[PDB]
Amino acid sequence: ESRGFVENSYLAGLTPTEFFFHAMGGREGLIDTAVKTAETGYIQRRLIKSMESVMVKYDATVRNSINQVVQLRYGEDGLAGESVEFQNLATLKPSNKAFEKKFRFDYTNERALRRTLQEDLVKDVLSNAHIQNELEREFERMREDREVLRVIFPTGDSKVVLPCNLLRMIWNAQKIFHINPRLPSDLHPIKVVEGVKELSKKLVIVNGDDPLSRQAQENATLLFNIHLRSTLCSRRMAEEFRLSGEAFDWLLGEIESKFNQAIAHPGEMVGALAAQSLGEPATQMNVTLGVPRLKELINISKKPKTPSLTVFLLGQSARDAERAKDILCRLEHTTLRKVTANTAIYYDPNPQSTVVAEDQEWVNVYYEMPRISPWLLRVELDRKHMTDRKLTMEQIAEKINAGFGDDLNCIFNDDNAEKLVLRIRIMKMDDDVFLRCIESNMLTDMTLQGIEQISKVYMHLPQTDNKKKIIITEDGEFKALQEWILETDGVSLMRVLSEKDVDPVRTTSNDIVEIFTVLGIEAVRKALERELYHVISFDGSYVNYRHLALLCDTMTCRGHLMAITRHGVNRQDTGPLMKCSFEETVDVLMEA
Amino acid sequence: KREWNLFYQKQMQLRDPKIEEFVPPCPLKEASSRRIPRLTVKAREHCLRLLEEALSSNRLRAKAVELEHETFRNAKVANLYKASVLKKVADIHRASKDGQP
Amino acid sequence: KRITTPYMTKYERARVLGTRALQIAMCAPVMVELEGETDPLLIAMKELKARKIPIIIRRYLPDGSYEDWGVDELIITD
Amino acid sequence: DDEEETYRLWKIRKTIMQLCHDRGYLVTQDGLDQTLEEFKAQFGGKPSEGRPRRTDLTVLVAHNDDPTDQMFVFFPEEPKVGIKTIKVYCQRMQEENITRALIVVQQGMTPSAKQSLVDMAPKYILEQFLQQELLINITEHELVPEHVVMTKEEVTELLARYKLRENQLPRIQAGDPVARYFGIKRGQVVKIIRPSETAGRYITYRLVQ
Amino acid sequence: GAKKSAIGQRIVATLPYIKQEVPIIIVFRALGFVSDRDILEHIIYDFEDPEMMEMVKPSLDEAFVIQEQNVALNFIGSRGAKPGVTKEKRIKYAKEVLQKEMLPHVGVSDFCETKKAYFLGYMVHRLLLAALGRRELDDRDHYGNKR
């Protein structure tokens, strides 16, 4: 009750303290509503100015006002956004045995043949050999497509967005032609195979006959052709759908018509479309997400508000907590102040008669078997922090020797005694002021362990299917594994990647400038797309991938990061009249 | 700042007489070698006598020379080699307190 | 050798319809027998359906070239 | 430590072997795949006061299309490589009749040395790689799609097919990490092959400029 | 650097109508107090506080040079709105500022130094208490701190 938990409902009413606390709660909502609007409008305006003149040319390429290629095919496939639908691939997830049983078309049992295919067709199937060779080649092609799919889509996601809804088209064909599923059909599986092969030739995105053009078309229609073959497999047609001749012909005609209608029309203003599509969710939008994150990603800064670096471990460190904690120790910065307990500066010229009575025995043992200055620098190390990081006094001593050379002296006790003692002596320029500078440097500059600029490192098991490692078993399924993943504060990507027992493939940060300077421009494009997808989908919202790809390509087209500001807008070699209308009019005009 | 290293090394030059040379002998292995930084025959015999006293109290001079020569080979400078020999003497002292051979 | 798409895009359809309607409204001959219609936009749509609009669309490729497609030759999608 | 220094030398050597294999030079499978113990045995498990002294690890290898065109991989023993070291290396290249060479640096090179490397560009080609930049292979990172260097015959065919002037392609800086990995000069065009979410594959092109 | 690293924290005062900052001991001396014992009587009320004494020590280490009221006033007045070409006028300007624009609410008469010193010592003492984590920092949105 003291900190504001309203026990009553709106029907019973609120006691005065709960009334005031509720008003304090609602004020925050009013403030956020009145605050987000201007920033959202400004972000949308900047995006529109950035991509206002990007168009789809009659060449089918996507070019800006200076005829510089942005995408060779819009959305990497050449289709329009408003004509595509969610669909499932249905050949990626099934195991080996299930996949073979569902897509093989056994022509040997012959009782399933008599039950599903007609009598005049079963004799043909059992007699011919060219038919059998074609039917085996079809399954070979499907297996190769399955492997390609598993490479393209790790983590086993079937859901995909493709232009023609094949299952609903099949349902419509069944209802239109009054197909009875309880009777054998008159569809020849060879007719099915030949029809699909001929159909795939009429779905042309890249027109040409050179090897380059044929390769471009294959890349442009690979996924849809894989889906088409998976759906119109002959065994699936014979078992599940049970179509007929005229039904199959109508289905092929409808597929051609819909694919041809779902192709992007030249002249579209895809740049402005993408700007609006990515900026309209902004008005409804321990790290930063939402409007501030979008602002940072659009105008890239070298100092993000909450830099982070998710780290994946390679082997037994991923499972066993021992090496996990060991890597956690290796990757976290730690100076001497993090472990020291207390320090003091004494005046003790006598090696034997020591002002401090604790060090007597071992300091005498050290001095008995051999100038120097009479002053001292006695420090005391906290036992809890000393033993937490698995540190050793010999390690601290050798680090001090490396850091200062042999112009210092160091004598240290061991963990046997309850008091762990380090004693330092030097082997204008007066001693006391020099020892205070030695202590101050040795406590804020020592860098015993860890990587500089890496402040704090967490260590927690993942709970999401994108931050988990997913493998493919020997039986072909997808199995999800839980392995320890780290999450640091502060970024230094190169050192963490170079560290022993750290996975150099899946390790990633969220600083775009760092990704650039370490991995190039294509990696920065992919990472920028992933960060934008994460910030957009945190709210559960959906935005078509074409708009994300267009924004990322526009930002990373010229080889260096182009922040969407006056700097990036005027860096383009465009006409002065486009730049004058944006964040700098008179200066640009007078320069030109 | 990197100005600290310049300040520090200036103050240590201002801390000159010449560094003392090595002199060859001794029961210790390789004791004629000048290669260990700041080492001497007297420091090696003092460490060998410490190892021999600890092994004799636990109980032979061969084991004492092996512990000294191993530690003088592994340590960065003779001042750390002597401190690590005294650390091995303290570990033998915990073994004798535990009654272990 | 023409490589541009054989369909008439929505923008080409809109501009052709607007220009043909303006031409009709400026007292120009029609290429179809109007069955009672009087609105220039309706007559232009009827002509487009009949494939009798006498316009050739000049499509500019980005490399400076161009292609002339008659309305009769372009598949009318919508 | 000696173990850590051996590990760093081994990792640098392995990455350079992978780099040469990608650049088309002729590196055998056994050279490509060496275990840490095998490297310890072959060239010293003790670096400090041991056989591997950042020398004798230099690699001379011949391109698969021309045994006459060969490349060096030098390991300076100095944390700051200098003008005289660069002159020594260029003298060795001149006497061995070698055009191209790599130089892995402990910490860095002075700007004078870098400019003295740039000056002899038509005479000789030398590249600087830091010790930290080679402990990992940036190409193997999953964020980095496959890059293919395109010949000037394919660039011409591509330009003719799309009717593009080279100004109209996307660009990639000559200081890019992958560009330095492949050793690409200005005017060459790289090809990017990456899988796609909406098409299944997408081939882009970048101009080094 | 070495000297800044050893000093750590120093206490400075931004007097009005003065070009830049002034160390606090300089102002206290300009008020007419010379002995470190007296200045610490004005600032640290209970001398059995070694942490407070150590915190104020680097501020007193800036008094190694200045030791007299005349030179302290000169140092203060050197940084006026219009620096003078003479020295007596600068010293008179320094005294005028310390008598007219520094803490007007305590007093403006001739004998107000004995109370201005106490109030400035209280300001420094409260700053030390804030730095030691013994009192909560104020918030501007608290409505007792408004008019």
Add this chain to the structure above:
RNA sequence: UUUGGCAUAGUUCC
């Protein structure tokens, strides 16, 4: 059947 502007304040809608 002819045409003032600058500033400030309040309010409506996302």
Add this chain to the structure above:
DNA sequence: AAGAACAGAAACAACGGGCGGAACTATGCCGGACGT
């Protein structure tokens, strides 16, 4: 074994431009003194 002049690269400090979209009422103000 020493010294000087020059030059390339970098740390810190100061300066300048940038900051939502529409719409509707009302009220005050647009320079001051002077006498030949």
Add this chain to the structure above:
DNA sequence: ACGTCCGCCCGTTGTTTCTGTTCTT
């Protein structure tokens, strides 16, 4: 009765500093 004088971020550019080269003694 007119006419004269009087509140926060981050891209540029400067200043200053710190090492490397080459010639000479």
